[PDB]
């Protein structure tokens, strides 16, 4: 069972390079607007306490170099929305997909297209952590890389990349420029709040392992929802809600394992460990597959 | 470290569907040729022990329905190369990238663009196991999905999907239609699998690059002595090509390949002794030397 990203071609056709001064990162070109992180306008010194409105009013359209492949796009206007800059260009992107901007919830997954100098480099699946970080793979120059889901022909953009934290996890914004989490686009070492494990996702994954013939971790027992949730919170697992239980129905039907029966299996794993065994290849309980993800991939 | 696929857009621009009767699978459209698994020409009854040569003689161009989306592509010629069908079409694919056809070695990784009815569903990284199988996520209708790597702007196609083995792993061919491994497109067991030594060594190099180097020792080994030990632990023997592709990581860390082999040999013989490497007690074997350099840089 495989962590699978959405096909990235519709997003690749939107990625451009944005340069201001000696800073280069990526931008997302939709119709005649390029979206990018606003910290592109900051210098070494600005970045410790950047007064962005004051820094932006001092910029001219020609201070922004936007390049799509070999071609330069002419910036004819700019504006700032929260932590994103919106560069109006004189050319429409003919590869603009059907799209929307969404703000995702913790526990939801999305695909990241990691880009450098406006060129796509890799694609992988991430989850919005309960503490609003993401465990990404982002190096210098990756800012402006985006995260997205696809439904039919519509790209739902949910993430734009801005920073890496001292622990090696990542933080960013939605496409309205609002950060996920308590982070700020200044050049400071920032810690996240305590992370927790996405319980509804671990349960989806356990069901996926059953669907794939792996059942060593099952047991004959059950648990109530509240008693499960007491043990969950003790182990820094998120509470499981009745909506989560409802969401897991399809995987429950399929396998004929009641949700609360799988909860009792997970409780045993938290208390007893895996004893060196592995599940779906992993020595660790995996929490970045949603129920939808498991079903979407057991469906086609 | 994450499994990271290559961006799939250049390959999405080449996917089509190929139907013969009611059997639809995926094909790859490059210039004026569509490549797909030859078993598209088989009914269920032929799938037992098909006579592909006979089946292909009974076929004509007008029996093949090739479609990009719902747009038919006219077939003007057909031929068989090993286990792939090549359909000449009357239109050169305007989205053809720079490409080549490569046959990869066990241990090498590649991106799979899983497709159904010519439409991409997902992309993910696979490693060719030493027993010439991959652990895919392939369902009915996935055949003809391809595996690839991208270098600069050149797509190297290395895999086309054909079948699922009893144990739930996957087998297929290169783009010249030669199966990886001893498999045939009929109605077979994968050889017992082994650990991909060259990738474990890449993973130890990765750990060193990140400052996790407790396992380095003061000794070395010959390649023969290491290979003989490794096989007792169900690890693949190293080839000269493996030594060579570890060269960049050896040079980045200053740790000779054979010195790293001696460190690995000690881990195998003594175990981890309760310690971890890059946070795990398990040694990862699905990241190549190129994967490591690509994520550390
Ligand atoms: C895109 O411009 C980059 C992307 C990051 C670079 C390395 N990996 C990334 O994901 N974004 C930035 O560099 C951020 C810019 C500010 C928001 C203005 N800054 C940033 O990511 O800082 C990262 C460094 C490295 C690790 C860390 O903890 N850190 C913060 C820091 C800052 C100052 C002193 C000490 C630590």
CB contact under 8 A, B12 and A9: yes
Nearest CA to A144 among A15, A11, A7, A13?
A15
CA distance B294 to A236: 33
Residue of B nearest to A14 (CA): B9
Collect all residues with Cβ–Cβ distance below 8 Å to B5 and sequence separation of at least 6: A5, A122, A123, A124, B111, B112, B123, B124, B125
What the block records as the tokens of B163 is 């079948």
C-alpha radius of gyration, chain B, whole number: 22
In a domain, B180, yes or no: no
CA distance A146 to B30: 29
Residue A244: what are its φ and ψ, rounded to 5°? -55, -45
For residues A252 and A106, membership in a common domain is answered with no
Nearest CA to A147 among A130, A167, A125?
A125
For residues B126 and B225, membership in a common domain is answered with no
Which of B108, B138, B173 is the last residue in one of the domains? Answer: B173
Please, what is the angle between helix A259-272 and helix A225-234, to 10°? 30
> CB-CB: which of A3, A13, A212 is closest to B3?
A3
Other Cβ atoms less than 10 A from the Cβ of B14: the count is 23
Host domain of residue B131: 9-173
In a domain, B186, yes or no: no
Report helix, strand or coil for B158. Answer: strand
- CATH code, A236: 1.10.1840.10
In a domain, B205, yes or no: yes
For residues B23 and B159, membership in a common domain is answered with yes
In a domain, B4, yes or no: no
For residues B19 and B161, membership in a common domain is answered with yes
Tokens 């799209």 correspond to what residue?
A99
Nearest CA to A209 among A116, A124, A128, A297?
A297
Ligand 1 centroid – CA B230 distance (Å): 42
Residue B214 and residue B287 in contact, taking contact as beta carbons nearer than 8 Å: no
Tokens 């695909």 correspond to what residue?
A111
For residues B164 and B46, membership in a common domain is answered with yes
- CATH code, A49: 2.40.10.10
Nearest CA to B134 among B175, B95, B173, B82?
B173
For residues B135 and B207, membership in a common domain is answered with no
Q: Is B120 on the interface with A (CB under 8 A)?
A: yes
In a domain, B184, yes or no: no
Collect all residues with Cβ–Cβ distance below 8 Å to A254 and sequence separation of at least 6: A207, A211, A298
Number of separate domains in chain B: 2
Residue B268 C-alpha, separation from nearest chain A C-alpha, in angstroms: 17
| Residues of A (186-215) whose Cβ lies below 8 Å from B | 212-213
For residues A220 and A272, membership in a common domain is answered with yes
In a domain, B183, yes or no: no
For residues A217 and A156, membership in a common domain is answered with no
In a domain, B265, yes or no: yes
Tokens 């990009």 correspond to what residue?
B68
In a domain, B70, yes or no: yes
What the block records as the tokens of A169 is 């996890």
CA distance A16 to A87: 12
Which of B173, B207, B231 is the last residue in one of the domains? Answer: B173
For residues B210 and B143, membership in a common domain is answered with no
CA distance B63 to B112: 29
What the block records as the tokens of A93 is 């992107």
Nearest CA to A175 among A109, A88, A114, A84?
A84
Tokens 């491994």 correspond to what residue?
B181
Experimental method: X-ray
CA distance B270 to A25: 47
For residues B67 and B168, membership in a common domain is answered with yes
Residue B159 and residue B170 in contact, taking contact as beta carbons nearer than 8 Å: no
CA distance B187 to B195: 28
For residues A16 and A141, membership in a common domain is answered with yes
For residues B56 and B134, membership in a common domain is answered with yes
Report helix, strand or coil for B85. Answer: strand
Q: Is B231 on the interface with A (CB under 8 A)?
A: no
């Amino acid at each position: 069972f495989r962590k699978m990203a959405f096909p990235s071609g519709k997003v690749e056709g939107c990625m451009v390079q944005v340069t201001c001064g000696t800073t280069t990162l990526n931008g997302l070109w939709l119709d005649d607007v390029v979206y990018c992180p606003r910290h592109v306008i900051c210098t070494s010194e600005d970045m410790l306490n950047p007064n962005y409105e004051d820094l932006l009013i001092r910029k001219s359209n020609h201070n922004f170099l936007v390049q799509a492949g070999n071609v330069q796009l002419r910036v004819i206007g700019h504006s700032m929305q929260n932590c994103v800059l919106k560069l109006k260009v004189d050319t429409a992107n003919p590869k603009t997909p059907k799209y929307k901007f969404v703000r995702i919830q913790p526990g939801q997954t999305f695909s990241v297209l990691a880009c450098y100098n406006g060129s796509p480099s890799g694609v992988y699946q991430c989850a919005m952590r309960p503490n609003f970080t993401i465990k990404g793979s982002f190096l210098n120059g990756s800012c402006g890389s985006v995260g997205f889901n696809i439904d039919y022909d519509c790209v739902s953009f949910c993430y734009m990349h801005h920073m890496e934290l001292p622990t090696g996890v990542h933080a960013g914004t939605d496409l309205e420029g609002n950060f996920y989490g308590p982070f700020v686009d200044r050049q400071t070492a920032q810690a996240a709040g305590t992370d927790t494990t996405i319980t509804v996702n671990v349960l989806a994954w356990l069901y996926a392992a059953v669907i794939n013939g792996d059942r060593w971790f099952l047991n004959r027992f059950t648990t109530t929802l509240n008693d499960f949730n007491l043990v969950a919170m003790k182990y820094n697992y998120e509470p499981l809600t009745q909506d989560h239980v409802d969401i897991l129905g399809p995987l429950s039907a399929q396998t004929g394992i009641a949700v609360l029966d799988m909860c009792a299996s997970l409780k045993e794993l938290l208390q007893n460990g895996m004893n060196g065994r592995t599940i779906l290849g992993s020595a660790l309980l995996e929490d970045e597959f949603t129920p939808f993800d498991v079903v979407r991939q057991c469906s086609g």
